[PDB]
Write a protein that binds this ligand. Structure first.
Ligand SMILES: [Ag+]
Ligand SMILES: [Ag+]
Ligand SMILES: [Ag+]
Ligand SMILES: [Ag+]
Lengths: 106, 106
């Protein structure tokens, strides 16, 4: 499974796919920590997008995110194969705002 | 099968894959035309590239191109799934220079 550890300001975000990422339905699990302490009850948003490029207009998919057993589960539908940019936006319970970026090849 | 029609000044460039494009060996047929007239004896170059990504170093592949009476066969090996930038460069026998860009999501 696809897995990466991202840095978002002072925050560490581990992201892992449930299975191999493919065109269609996808599930990802996110584990955000701040100085080693897991971020609980946070607002987590995950956006997948392919930027505007020669021959292809920009497209964006917003994941449905839910918190389960201390982890954040992001479900989305990726309508086509190709390279997808991943943007993670987190707002902690205290109001702190963090952002991390990466990309994956489908 | 992948199929696209691009516009380069007065020239139209049709590109079509032989079969469904998949990771590995791929063949494309290019048909450049000027007002319906096939462009024969032209110098045709086709480049496939993936830019630098997290977890992936940049790669560029130049196709091997051959001509058959105005149709140009471009053979290449695309080693990974993901978005490939496609750049077509044509120099006609009469001296015109054209460039068209597109992308292929594998
Ligand atoms: Ag797309
Ligand atoms: Ag694209
Ligand atoms: Ag690549
Ligand atoms: Ag890549």
């Amino acid at each position: 499974p696809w897995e990466q550890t991202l840095k978002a300001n002072d925050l560490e975000v581990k992201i892992k796919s449930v299975g191999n990422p493919i065109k269609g339905d996808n599930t990802f699990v996110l584990s955000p920590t701040l100085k080693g302490k897991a971020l609980e009850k946070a607002i987590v948003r995950v956006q997948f997008m392919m930027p505007e490029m020669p021959g292809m207009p920009a497209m964006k998919e917003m994941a449905q995110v839910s918190e389960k057993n201390g982890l954040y589960e992001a479900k989305t539908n990726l309508s086509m194969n190709g390279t997808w940019q991943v943007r993670v936006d987190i707002k902690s319970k205290e109001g702190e705002v963090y952002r991390a970026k990466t990309s994956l090849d489908l």
